[PDB]
Design a protein around this ligand. Sequence first.
Ligand SMILES: Nc1ncnc2c1ncn2[C@@H]1O[C@H](COP(=O)(O)O)[C@@H](O)[C@H]1O
Lengths: 395, 342
Amino acid sequence: TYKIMAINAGSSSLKFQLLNMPQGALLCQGLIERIGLPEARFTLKTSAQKWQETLPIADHHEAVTLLLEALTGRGILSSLQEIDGVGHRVAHGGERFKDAALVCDDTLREIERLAELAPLHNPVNALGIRLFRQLLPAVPAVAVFDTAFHQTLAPEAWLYPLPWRYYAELGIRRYGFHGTSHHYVSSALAEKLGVPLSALRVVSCHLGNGCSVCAIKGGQSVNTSMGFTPQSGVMMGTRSGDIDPSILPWLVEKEGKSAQQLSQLLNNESGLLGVSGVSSDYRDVEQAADAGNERAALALSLFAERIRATIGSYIMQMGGLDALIFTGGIGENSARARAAICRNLHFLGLALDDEKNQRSATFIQADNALVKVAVINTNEELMIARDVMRLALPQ
Amino acid sequence: YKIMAINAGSSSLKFQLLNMPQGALLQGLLKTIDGVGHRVAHGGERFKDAALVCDDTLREIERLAELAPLHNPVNALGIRLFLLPAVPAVAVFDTAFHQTLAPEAWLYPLPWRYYAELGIRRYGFHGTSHHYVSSALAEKLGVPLSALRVVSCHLGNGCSVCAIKGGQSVNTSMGFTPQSGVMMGTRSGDIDPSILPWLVEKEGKSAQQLSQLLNNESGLLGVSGVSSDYRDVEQAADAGNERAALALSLFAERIRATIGSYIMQMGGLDALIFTGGIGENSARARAAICRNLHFLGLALDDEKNQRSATFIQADNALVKVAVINTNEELMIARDVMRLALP
Ligand SMILES: Nc1ncnc2c1ncn2[C@@H]1O[C@H](COP(=O)(O)O)[C@@H](O)[C@H]1O
């Protein structure tokens, strides 16, 4: 067995998991949040216990220090030498990274170069990589990019119909995200079916606060709904997803919106929150909808419709469908959302078993359906730990 | 009867006089009067159908210039000129056919007030074309249009797709303005909306420049670097221009993605219609759009497609695939007949 730590560094946060590999058992997990802010908090959980303290945490360096000291201070590790590898979530690998990469000087420059494409995430992702290299110098580290799984998209799927120089000189194209989650659940589906992923045409729906759909054919991503940034594609908690682009110049002219306000509009004020007027949380919107709030009911119906439209585009592209996967916090738990998304799909041989769907069984398709419909819990940290093993510990 | 179809472009004036009912032509800005029909670009939510031209109609139109400020004004001007005070007139709106869309199809996932206070929503256009060719299809097949699940592709310099189920438009690809949906001659269609704030920040684009980018510099012209005209791009791709070949592949991909959404929404497909300058004449575009669709029972017959036959699906195919020449002036004249000489 090996001890692999999965790290996700945010602008003011540090998420971590420590896993026993290859079995994937969780030794501990937690979150340091409001780094640099007042009310900074360090949470740490094992299977048996939870510890939580509000205390000043100036920067990510202090966050990493407190984490490493707690690993031994709580008897989780006898020593930091027990750590065999670290996997780092990186938001954007551009076209440079088609797979996870061993951390090294060139990897770090590339990730910082790509800050131009993810300004709020890639720099702190790299800071985390640097802090662990500094504080755990002897532990190999692997960068795992949320974009890499989608680097197999063909040009007619990633080119936008803008003038060519917007791609050629400015890098504007569809990248796609949730790559680690779509890779994880699609591989898990094939393992559960006992067939190679390459034999299946798969549509994968990651439905959480962020939401994305991915088409997987021949074992490779061939399309996915987020585009240039994680703002686009289907409707989400606060993100609009795709809208008529000509709305934005209209709003700049009418309301004088700045670029920053336009992004805030598209990313923080839209989606379930903007339509329902209630909440970004699917459960909250559903609760209001069942009590008669018509905007909330419309929010939920539009949410399912946008996902259905995207599934339909990708079934068309692949020439049919063998399996549909639901994952994420909504896809895993909402029998009602899955039922609305899957309704009236007899032209595909796709129908649900209501009893299986109601209990979120692993497979929820009807007895005589031609399409497998799976509810699979996504585990991005396990996926990252597997990439660490593959690239840092081939032995 | 003699019906006059009028299209008042902001510096032009297309005209057609037809022998109704059978629609024989008597063409204009001249080739070889019971009522006049006026093309109107935007009917908002107010007009679900063509309307008799009266005072009420005319200032409802001129109010909607708040949404179509560069077209509705001189459309209503052309109406007011017709100076022809004894001839009944009817306004035919490019948006009206799509007023049967349900909220799930026309509401954007924006803050609610953008719809509720500013009227921002999907309207859709090419309504008279989609209405015309879908009705003609049902007539050719000899069944009610309400019996068919139809996807209609109007492919010309402007391009749009429309899903028709139960005899009504249930979705269409152009949105708030005619800029959006699929890739076109110079219009980009739908793109990742987050690109635009990025461009404002990185290149200092004004709203005007963003509009010019989306409407005049993108599409076939922007991708190919050759032309906004499909045939010109095709010539260059045939000669080895890689961008031109990519432009044509992306053009078909965008239409296919949209067709797939609409098939999903309708729960299947009975017929696909191609119309417009590209749809009526390009065997290549139709074949690339219809590739590898056996899961729907849709395949093309190469000999029929090559000569643009009225029906081009393979004889073993379940889905009818039709090539129908659109005739919006005839459609307008039929609207005049129905509302002004009933
Ligand atoms: N039991 C549940 N039923 C429906 N939605 C849920 C449930 N639990 C969490 N969610 C939703 O999952 C989303 C976030 O999940 P994630 O970001 O994938 O962890 C939020 O919109 C939540 O409302």
